[PDB]
């Protein structure tokens, strides 16, 4: 789906599979968080479903030792003095020792501050222990988490329930047309992007000899030239758009290990899983009731949340008993208006537009020489048109799909292309779509705050600040304190400070709240980028203070207060909202649960070969399942005729569903249902 999606997948740790356990065999002990998991396997990242606890991700700093156990790094303390010497410990080995927490205060030389410090001990027990007994201490505060987990800003402000979903959903993010790096980071966004392999890293140092949209050439120092080819508009495993673009310009000095060209969901070598949106924390005319989301039409007019989705359509020509399937531009009883977008072969032309029902690859097969209908024999004598022995077996566009044909791949047995036994010509047409964001598309933040798009208002309807700028996204207030994930609130505060810029007051000295604040953050530009590492980073006192530091806009006016709130104007009634609303910037990702895929319906269609019931799935154009649970609801209501119809003429009544289709199109009354063919099957299976 995205670069991170792949990266996560390679670091999964399942207990499933041969040699391991089954899903039904696993009790409640296997699944929950064990003490030894610290720094080895994440306690947060795990599926929501029936696989929960049986699947996890490897902690960031961990590694595997030659015996198949999991080791993890710790700093070695000689005698109250931290040493840069690091040794990897296994699970049971650590239990024999005693480990201090990472954030414990350390002297500039290496010594501890207090005699008694926080201490980790065997069996998950913790106590205060004198500094003389300290063996090791953690490498990092963020040592226990996984890769996707450490990418959640203010993690320690969100409950494990939503923070879990916050990690799982990132993996579901969709690559947009172009991607922006988050205003609020955690620092992990860089190393994740590089180690993904879906960016282009320079092997050896040198200078960009030539750059094009096609490839980048690098002139090394010894003289040799390596050329890096750009993946352009390729279809991923999940129909997303892997598209790479050159970062460097021609003539730039580039060193080894530097990102010279990034891919989808990447901005300057950083994981760009979403966009920075101007949020507003408030109910608004109910359109965001129960976790729904309201969007500015600006995100539709500026493609801010627009994505490209590529599909691979396939069809082949085989050797049959009545001859052989041939791919031709001549299809029985079709006008030249339908064939208009094909070439001479029968293939669609690259760049052509395709809607559902249209033809991609014209194929016809010799139909069996069975006696044609005496009523169709008569119909062929009047108009004197002799019947062809070739039936239409063309590759048409599936319901819902549409877009521009962006390439053809043809494999012919004729052109020595090696095919499976029986196949002559195989055609692959690739169609991409430029899906703008719409109603029902699932959006989310990094804090387990999900939901679908309820409504996208015109840009003017949007609640706007004093200077006229309309907000992008309107989240509902109700669904915040319940989820305990108020890290989305802190992200909004720091997110605003990062957009406006700030400057701590240095007159009369450096203030007491911004005393722990490193020098480099005492002055910030508009649209600045910052890091809030998990279990480190910003604290509530500095955030509050920074809200006072907010630099005024172009008109010389500050827009938000020290509370973080601001005054909005209702774009509909014009009047100002009575109370200050919390405004700022938030990072919102486009998840891969789009209505354009999710929507589906069916009148009649294909049917089961045995039970004679409808088929199942959107891929087979099947109808919904009216299960045992749903038949109780009907029964409870006392809607016998509705229930009967659903299981008879709507289902597997061979003669009924046909005579229902006829009764409808003729405008008569629905006939009386017969016997469910499935019941006939049962009485034969019993026999």
């Amino acid at each position: 789906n995205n670069p991170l999606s792949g990266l996560t997948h390679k670091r999964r740790l399942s207990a499933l599979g041969p040699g391991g356990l089954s899903r039904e065999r696993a009790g409640l002990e296997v699944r929950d968080v064990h003490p030894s998991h610290y720094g080895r396997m994440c306690p947060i990242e795990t599926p929501e479903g029936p696989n929960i606890g049986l699947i996890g991700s490897l902690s960031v700093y961990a590694r595997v030792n030659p015996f198949g156990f999991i080791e993890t790094p710790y700093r070695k303390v000689v005698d109250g003095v931290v040493s840069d010497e690091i040794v990897y410990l296994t699970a049971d080995e650590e239990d024999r020792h005693v480990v201090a927490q990472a954030n414990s205060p350390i002297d500039a030389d290496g010594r501890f501050v207090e005699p008694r410090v926080l201490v980790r001990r065997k069996a998950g027990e913790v106590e205060y222990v004198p500094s003389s007994e300290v063996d090791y201490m953690d490498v990092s505060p963020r040592q226990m988490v996984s890769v996707a987990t450490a990418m959640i800003p203010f993690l320690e402000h969100d409950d494990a329930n939503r923070a879990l979903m916050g990690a799982n959903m990132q993996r579901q993010a969709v690559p947009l047309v172009r991607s922006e790096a988050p205003l609020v980071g955690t620092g992990m966004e860089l190393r994740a992007a590089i180690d993904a392999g879906d960016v282009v890293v320079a092997e050896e140092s040198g200078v960009i000899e030539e750059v094009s949209a096609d490839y980048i050439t690098v002139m090394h120092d010894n003289g040799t030239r390596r050329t890096y080819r750009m993946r352009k508009f390729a279809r991923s495993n999940h129909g997303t758009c892997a598209n790479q673009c050159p970062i460097v310009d021609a003539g730039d000095r580039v060193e080894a290990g530097q990102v010279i060209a990034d891919g989808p969901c990447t901005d300057d070598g950083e994981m760009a899983l979403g966009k920075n949106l101007l949020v507003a924390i408030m109910p608004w005319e109910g359109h965001n009731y129960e976790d729904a989301i309201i969007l500015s039409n600006r995100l539709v007019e500026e493609d801010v949340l627009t994505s490209i989705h590529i599909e691979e359509h396939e069809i082949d020509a085989r050797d049959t008993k009545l001859g052989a399937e041939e791919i031709t531009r001549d299809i029985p009883n079709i006008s030249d208006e339908v064939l208009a977008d094909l070439d001479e072969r029968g293939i669609v032309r690259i760049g052509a537009e395709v809607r559902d029902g249209d033809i991609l690859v014209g194929k016809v097969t010799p139909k069996g020489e069975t006696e044609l209908t005496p009523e169709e024999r008569l119909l062929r004598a009047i108009f004197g048109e002799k019947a062809r022995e070739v039936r239409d077996t063309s590759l048409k566009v599936p319901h819902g799909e549409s877009g521009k044909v962006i390439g053809i791949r043809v494999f012919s047995r004729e052109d020595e292309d090696e095919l499976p036994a029986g196949v002559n010509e195989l055609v692959r047409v690739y169609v991409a779509q430029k899906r703008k964001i719409s109603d029902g598309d699932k959006l989310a933040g990094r804090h387990g705050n999900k939901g679908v798009i309820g409504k996208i208002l015109p840009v003017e309807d949007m609640p706007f600040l004093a200077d006229g700028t309309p907000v992008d996204i309107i989240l509902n207030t109700h669904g915040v304190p319940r989820r305990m994930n108020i890290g989305q609130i802190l992200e909004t505060h720091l997110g605003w400070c990062a957009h406006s810029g700030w400057k701590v007051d240095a007159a009369k000295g450096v203030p007491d709240w911004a005393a722990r604040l490193p020098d480099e953050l005492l002055e910030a530009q508009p649209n600045a980028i910052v890091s809030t590492p998990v279990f480190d980073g910003a604290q509530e006192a500095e955030l509050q203070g920074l809200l006072s530091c907010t630099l005024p806009n172009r008109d010389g006016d500050v827009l938000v207060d020290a509370d973080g709130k601001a005054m909005l104007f209702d774009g509909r009634s014009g009047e100002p909202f009575p109370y200050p609303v919390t405004v700022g910037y938030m990072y919102i990702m486009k998840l891969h649960h789009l209505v354009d895929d999710k929507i589906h319906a069916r009148s009649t269609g294909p049917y089961s070969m045995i039970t004679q019931q409808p088929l199942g799935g959107k891929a087979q154009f099947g109808g919904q399942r009216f299960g045992e649970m749903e038949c109780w609801a009907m029964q409870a209501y006392g809607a016998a005729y509705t229930l009967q119809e659903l299981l008879t003429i709507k289902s597997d009544d061979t003669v009924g569903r046909v005579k229902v289709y006829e009764a409808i199109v003729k405008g008569e009354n629905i006939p009386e249902p017969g016997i469910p063919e499935s019941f006939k099957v049962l009485l034969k299976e019993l026999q």
Partner: peptide, 23 residues
């Protein structure tokens, strides 16, 4: 800065100085 190793954009960090080891 946070990761001053590859040649990356400068992302300033609220932090206690982390020099044990790179990821």
């Amino acid at each position: 800065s946070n990761n001053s190793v590859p040649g990356a954009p400068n992302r300033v960090s609220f932090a206690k100085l982390r020099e044990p080891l790179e990821v």
